[PDB]
Amino acid sequence: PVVAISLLDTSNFNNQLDQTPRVFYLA
Amino acid sequence: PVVAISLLDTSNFNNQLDQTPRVFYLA
Amino acid sequence: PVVAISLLDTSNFNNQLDQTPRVFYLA
Amino acid sequence: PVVAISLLDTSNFNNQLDQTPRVFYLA
Amino acid sequence: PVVAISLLDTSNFNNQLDQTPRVFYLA
Amino acid sequence: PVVAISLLDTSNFNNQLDQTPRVFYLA
Amino acid sequence: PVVAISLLDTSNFNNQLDQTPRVFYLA
Amino acid sequence: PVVAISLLDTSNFNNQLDQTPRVFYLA
Amino acid sequence: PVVAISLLDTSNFNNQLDQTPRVFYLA
Amino acid sequence: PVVAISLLDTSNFNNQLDQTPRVFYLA
């Protein structure tokens, strides 16, 4: 009976990318 | 009976991208 | 009986993109 | 009865990328 | 009965990449 | 002068998802 | 002068997902 | 002068996922 | 002058996943 | 002058995963 062909291609989830640089160009 | 062909292509969810730089160009 | 062919292509949901830079160009 | 062919290709989840440099260019 | 062919290709999860350099270019 | 803060969150492009099953339920 | 803060979060592109099963339920 | 802070979080590209099972349930 | 802080977190590219089982349930 | 801080976290590329079992359940 039960036949289950599954293809789960997930990516890029539940992730936090924090880019908070501090550049002080004092000419 | 039950035949289930599934193709789940999910991406880019439940993720926070915080880009809060601080640039101080003091000429 | 039951035959279920499913193709779920979801993307870019439930995600917050915060871009709040602070640029201080003091000529 | 039960036959289950599964192909799960997940990547890049539940990971935090913190890039917070501090550059002090004092000319 | 039960036949289960599974192919799980996961990568790059639950890992934190902290790059916080401090560069002091004092010309 | 030139200060460029960019945040490009792109996903799910230039990819073909072909689901062409063949089910023969010969009761 | 040139300061470039960039955050490119791309995913799921230029990839083909072919799911072409053949199921013969000859009851 | 040139200061370049870059964060490239790419994943899941240029890869083909072929799932072509052959199931013969000859009851 | 040139200061380049880069963080390249790439994964899961240019790889083929072929799952082509052959199941013969001859009841 | 040239200062280059780089962090390249790559994984899971240019690799083929072939799973082609042959199961003969001759009940």
Numbering used by the authors:
A (entry chain E), B (entry chain C), C (entry chain A), D (entry chain G), E (entry chain I), F (entry chain B), ...: 164 to 190
List passages from the publication reporting this PDB structure.
As the most abundant plant‐derived protein, soy protein isolate (SPI) provides an ideal model for structural studies, with glycinin (11S globulin) and β‐conglycinin (7S globulin) as its major components. Further dissociation of glycinin into its acidic (A) and basic (B) subunits showed that fibrillization was strictly mediated by the acidic subunit (glycinin‐A), which produced well‐defined fibrils, whereas the basic subunit (glycinin‐B) showed no assembly propensity under identical conditions. Together, these structural and computational analyses consistently identify glycinin G4 as the predominant fibril‐forming protein in both polymorphic forms.
PM1 exhibited a characteristic twisted architecture with an 800 Å half‐period twist, corresponding to the 90 nm pitch observed by AFM. To build the atomic model of PM1 and identify the fibril‐constituting protein, we performed de novo model building using ModelAngelo without sequence constraints. Structural analysis further revealed that Val186 resides within the PM1 dimer interface, where spatial constraints favor small residues (e.g., valine in glycinin G4/G5) but exclude bulkier ones (e.g., arginine in glycinin G1/G2/G3). To discriminate between them, we observed that Leu170 in G4 fits the density map more accurately than Pro170 in G5, leading us to select the Pro164‐Ala190 segment of glycinin G4 for final model building. PM1 features spatially segregated hydrophilic (Asp172‐Asn178/Asn178’‐Asp172’) and hydrophobic (Val166‐Ile168/Val186’‐Pro184’) domains, a structural motif distinct from previously characterized amyloid folds in both pathological and functional contexts. The unique dual‐core architecture of PM1 fibrils confers exceptional interfacial properties through precisely organized surface domains. Hydrophobic edge residues (Phe187‐Ala190) facilitate adsorption at oil‐water interfaces, while adjacent hydrophilic regions (Asn177‐Arg185) maintain colloidal stability in aqueous environments.
